[PDB]
Structures are given as structure tokens and as C-alpha cells.
Amino acid sequence: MNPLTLAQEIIDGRRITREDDLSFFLTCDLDELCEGADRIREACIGDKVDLCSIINGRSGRCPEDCKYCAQSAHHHTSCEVYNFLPEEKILEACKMNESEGVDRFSIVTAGKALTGKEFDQAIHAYETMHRECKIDLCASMGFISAEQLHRLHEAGVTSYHHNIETSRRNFPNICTTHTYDMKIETLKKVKAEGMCACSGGIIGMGETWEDRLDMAISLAELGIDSIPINALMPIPGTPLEHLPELSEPDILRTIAFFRYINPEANIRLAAGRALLTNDGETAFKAGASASITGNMLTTVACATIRSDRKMLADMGRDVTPEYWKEV
Ligand SMILES: C[S@+](CC[C@H](N)C(=O)[O-])C[C@H]1O[C@@H](n2cnc3c(N)ncnc32)[C@H](O)[C@@H]1O
Numbered sequence: 070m071n072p073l074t075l076a077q078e079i080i081d082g083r084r085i086t087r088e089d090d091l092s093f094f095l096t097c098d099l100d101e102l103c104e105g106a107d108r109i110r111e112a113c114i115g116d117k118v119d120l121c122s123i124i125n126g127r128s129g130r131c132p133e134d135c136k137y138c139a140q141s142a143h144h145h146t147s148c149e150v151y152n153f154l155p156e157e158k159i160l161e162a163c164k165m166n167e168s169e170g171v172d173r174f175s176i177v178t179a180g181k182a183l184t185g186k187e188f189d190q191a192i193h194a195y196e197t198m199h200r201e202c203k204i205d206l207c208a209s210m211g212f213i214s215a216e217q218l219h220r221l222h223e224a225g226v227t228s229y230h231h232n233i234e235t236s237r238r239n240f241p242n243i244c245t246t247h248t249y250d251m252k253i254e255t256l257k258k259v260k261a262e263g264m265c266a267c268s269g270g271i272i273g274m275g276e277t278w279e280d281r282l283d284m285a286i287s288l289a290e291l292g293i294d295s296i297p298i299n300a301l302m303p304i305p306g307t308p309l310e311h312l313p314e315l316s317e318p319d320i321l322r323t324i325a326f327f328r329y330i331n332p333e334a335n336i337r338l339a340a341g342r343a344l345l346t347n348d349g350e351t352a353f354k355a356g357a358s359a360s361i362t363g364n365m366l367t368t369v370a371c372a373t374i375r376s377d378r379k380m381l382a383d384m385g386r387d388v389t390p391e392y393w394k395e396v
Pocket residue numbers: 137138139177178179180181209210211212230231232234270271299300301302303304340341
């Protein structure tokens with residue numbers, strides 16, 4: 070077995086399982102694994118690169134203890150602190166991302182879960198966006214209930230984001246206040262609601278190569294539709310502030326095997342894209358088919374949205390959103 074023929078087999082319908090020799094993806098040649106991942110992406114996704122965007126709808130004060138997170142109240146960081154934003158600020162950002170041609174937009178909230186009056190405020194914001202704007206809609210709100218997921222879906226939200234973060238084995242080393250099992254339960258609810266599930270995690274936090282493979286396999290078993298691969302941005306004041314940043318070859322290997330293991334998913338670049346040369350150009354040629362663009366939650370964009378769209382179009386990818394296709 071070799072990466073080039075294995076990519077052909079997957080194009081022709083083979084699917085990697087937990088019982089396959091996953092160590093192959095660690096020992097095989099990187100450039101061949103990238104080439105094969107790009108071919109799998111071309112066959113299963115095609116040339117569209119889906120671009121999404123986010124707003125930090127509620128910043129800081131989270132009681133959870135995730136070791137990477139700027140917004141955990143267990144850490145003293147530079148993060149802004151505010152309760153759920155006024156609707157006008159959300160609509161301003163939605164309209165801006167639509168003016169720039171982004172495919173979808175998400176409200177992302179710090180906290181264990183968004184509940185009660187602030188949840189109602191989010192719903193109202195989605196109703197206004199669904200009425201006024203053509204850009205598609207996502208939410209990332211923590212451990213919400215099935216009834217809340219249905220309310221989001223009825224208001225026009227089509228994807229729910231809930232990252233597994235790390236492998237099951239490594240999860241207790243990153244967070245003690247909630248569990249990996251709790252993440253999987255939310256994801257099952259997202260699928261039962263008929264929404265797209267967007268779930269990935271963070272690499273470079275000290276997890277092993279085998280943990281990264283287990284993340285990829287676990288998301289494949291769930292049928293996850295969109296998989297954000299964040300490289301750690303070490304945040305000053307958090308426990309992980311002094312971890313070394315990942316190299317481009319290590320990120321590319323990860324993107325590529327996530328593509329082999331999740332051939333039909335959008336493998337999506339997310340935080341840490343500045344670690345890649347040319348703001349991720351090579352990753353789009355190594356299995357990635359989607360990216361978050363523009364500003365993140367407490368850190369700034371690696372480039373403007375326009376720069377990302379021009380880079381992708383110049384390499385021959387399609388970045389025209391559906392709402393700009395008039396005829
Ligand atoms: C989506 S959560 C917000 C909603 C909710 N509180 C939750 O945890 O599901 C924000 C996402 O940002 C990513 N993230 C946070 N801090 C990061 C960092 N320093 N480097 C890379 N990714 C990070 C994590 O993967 C996390 O899932």
C-alpha cells in the first residue's frame with residue numbers, strides 16, 4: 070500500500086475504518102499523501118472552496134477550563150468581555166460578510182451553553198438575518214438542547230458547530246469541566262435535527278499523531294459534514310501559551326489524512342492559518358476544500374477576505390457564493 074493507489078481506491082469507493090492500519094498515514098511519504106488527498110478532494114468535493122465567517126457574539130467569562138481558550142475565566146488573557154451582542158452589531162457583520170461574498174456566517178458564543186434570554190436574542194438575530202440577507206447561517210453555542218437546535222433550524226440556521234477539540238484519550242488533558250462524551254451527545258442531536266454538523270478540533274496542543282488519527286476516524290464514524298482543523302494559536306495567559314507552534318509539514322500531513330479518512334467532508338482550514346505558507350495555499354492543494362475567512366474570536370485575521378478569495382480564484386478554485394449566481 071502506497072498513498073497514490075490508496076487515494077485511487079478511495080476515489081473508487083473504499084472507505085477507511087478504525088480497523089485499517091492508520092499508522093500508514095504517519096510513516097508514508099508526505100508529498101505523495103498530499104497529492105492523493107488533493108485527488109480525493111477533487112473527486113468528492115470538486116473545485117468549490119466554501120468560505121465561512123464568524124462573529125464573537127458573547128466574549129469571555131466562560132466557566133469551563135479548556136486549556137487553550139482565551140475566553141475561559143480561569144485564565145487572565147487580553148480578551149474582550151461582553152454579554153450577548155446587540156442585534157445591530159450582528160447584522161452589521163452578517164451584511165459585511167455577504168458584501169464580501171462569503172458563503173456562510175456564524176454567531177459564536179463563549180460559555181458552557183447559550184440559554185434563556187440571550188438565546189432568544191440570538192434567535193431574533195437569526196430571524197432578521199434570514200429575512201434581510203442571503204448568506205447562509207451557522208451557530209456555535211456550546212452544549213444546547215435538542216429543542217434549542219430545532220429553534221435555530223427553524224430560524225434559518227443550517228449548520229451547528231461543536232468541536233470535539235481533541236481525541237477521546239486526550240480530552241481530560243485539555244478540559245476537566247465537561248467531557249468528550251458530552252460533545253458526542255450534542256453532535257448526535259445535530260444530526261437528528263437534520264442540520265449540517267461542523268466538528269473538528271485543535272492540533273498542536275500536545276496530543277500525539279495517534280490522537281489526530283483517532284479524531285479523524287471518530288468524526289468519520291459520525292458522518293461529520295464539515296471538519297475545521299485549527300492549529301493551536303497559543304494564547305498569552307493560558308496554560309498552553311508556551312507550546313511551540315506547529316510546522317507546515319505537520320499541519321499538511323494532518324489535513325491530508327483527514328481527507329483520506331473523511332473523503333466526502335469539507336476539510337476546513339480555521340485558526341492558525343498564518344502557520345501555512347501563503348495563507349494556506351498549499352493546504353488547498355493537499356486535501357482542504359473550505360476555510361474560515363476574516364477575523365476570528367479574539368485574534369485577527371491572517372489576511373483579508375478579499376485576499377483569500379483572490380488567492381483561491383487565482384489557483385482555479387470556485388469561490389462564487391450561491392447568492393451571486395443570478396443566471
Ligand atoms: C466553538 S468554541 C465557542 C462555543 C462554545 N463555547 C464551545 O466551546 O463549543 C470556539 C472554538 O475555537 C477554537 N479555539 C479556541 N481557542 C483556540 C486557540 N487558541 N487556538 C486554536 N483554536 C482555538 C476551539 O476549537 C473552539 O471550539
